[PDB]
């Protein structure tokens, strides 16, 4: 149904956001310590 429908986009949306804001800090921060080397 539309509602659930809706809620697994949802959930969707909100796991991928905050996995591109942690592999973004994560490859920030890997770059920056292998540049030092």
Not at 8 to 30: D, Q, S, W
């Amino acid at each position: 149904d539309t509602a659930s429908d809706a809620a697994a986009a949802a959930a969707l949306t909100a796991a991928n956001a905050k996995a591109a804001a942690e592999l973004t800090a994560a490859n920030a921060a890997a770059a920056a310590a292998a540049t030092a080397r």
